């Protein structure tokens, strides 16, 4: 129903935002290893 | 040096954001599994 659909959408959003932050974290860690 | 210090700060910021989003993910999953 509507309530489940709303929650499922919110879950998809949060998962996508986490994936993006994790890519950023990996990139920043790579950089950290590239400076003095 | 300063470049490492800057990257370490950004890494702290990103981690805090991830941790908060992971808690939300858990809460939402819980609700759906409570159906």
Numbering used by the authors:
A (entry chain A): 12 to 47
B (entry chain B): 12 to 46
Q: What did the original publication write about this model?
A:
Instead of Gag, non-LTR retrotransposons frequently encode a distinct multidomain protein named ORF1p, which is translated from the first open reading frame (ORF1). To learn whether the esterase domain is more than a mere molecular fossil and to learn about the potential functions of esterase-encoding ORF1ps in non-LTR retrotransposition, we took a structure-based approach and characterized the ORF1p of the ZfL2-1 non-LTR retrotransposon from zebrafish, Danio rerio. We defined the boundaries of two functional domains and determined their crystal structures. We also demonstrate that the esterase is enzymatically active and binds to negatively charged liposomes. Together, these findings define a third class of ORF1p architecture and suggest that lipids may play a role in non-LTR retrotransposition.
The first structure is that of an N-terminal coiled coil domain that we show to cause a dimerization of the molecule, an assembly mode that is clearly distinct from the trimers formed by the LINE-1 ORF1p. In analytical SEC, the N-terminal construct indeed shows self-interaction and we find it to exclusively form dimers, whereas the esterase domain remains monomeric at concentrations up to 75 µM. A proteolytically stable fragment of the N-terminal construct gave crystals that contained two copies of an antiparallel homodimeric coiled coil per asymmetric unit, and the structure was refined to an Rfree of 21.5% at 1.55 Å resolution. Each α-helix comprises five heptad repeats, confining the coiled coil to the region between M15 and P47 as we would predict from the sequence. Because of the charge compensation between the highly acidic N-terminal heptads and the highly basic C-terminal heptads, we presume a preference for the antiparallel orientation also in the absence of crystal packing constraints, an arrangement that is clearly distinct from the parallel trimeric coiled coil formed by the LINE-1 ORF1p. Whereas coiled coil domains and their ability to multimerize are hence frequently present among ORF1ps, the resulting assemblies can differ significantly in terms of structure and likely do not always have a common evolutionary origin.
